[PDB]
Amino acid sequence: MRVLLLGPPGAGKGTQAVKLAEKLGIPQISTGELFRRNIEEGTKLGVEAKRYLDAGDLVPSDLTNELVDDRLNNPDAANGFILDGYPRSVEQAKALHEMLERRGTDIDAVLEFRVSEEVLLERLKGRGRADDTDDVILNRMKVYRDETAPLLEYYRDQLKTVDAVGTMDEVFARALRALGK
Secondary structure, eight states, X not given: OOEEEEOSSSSOSHHHHHHHHHHHTOOEEETTHHHHHHHHHTOSHHHHHHXXXXXXXXXXXXXXXXXXXXXXXXXXXXXXOEEESOOSSHXXXXXXXXXXXXXXXXXXXXXXXXXOHHHHHHTTTTSOOSSSTTHHHHHHHHHHHHHHHHHHHHHHHHXXXXXXXXXXXXXXXXXXXXXXX
């Protein structure tokens, strides 16, 4: 069995994705982490395709599903994998649905997180940067407007939800209540 981790901007996501990978025995692949490591190494598809996937200009499908398959290492990830933050937009995300149903991988849970504005307010309303954002938040709000209504029809027929606000150990109790038991 297998999981994909969905939700708008708002801190709560990756903390119960790494904790649920410790319970099940899986590769948790977050799409910013392996790509940021290729920015320090010096690839050239690391830096444009990671900024694009986070800032909001157009990123190609085949290289992004090639780096996901490199951290499958698949004779170990054919019956499991936890992805976080890859279906942001119906146009990149329909290539991953063409490979789960058309390629023919396990469908357990698309796990979408219901999270409040307060998580972004940790999400540096507390102390973390110096307006690299504002302009990156405006281009991300452009990719929010093109897709969110058609995206919630496709994934609203497919998904399971988690509530995720404030608390650490209570929010993990709701994440297994949706997926593990």
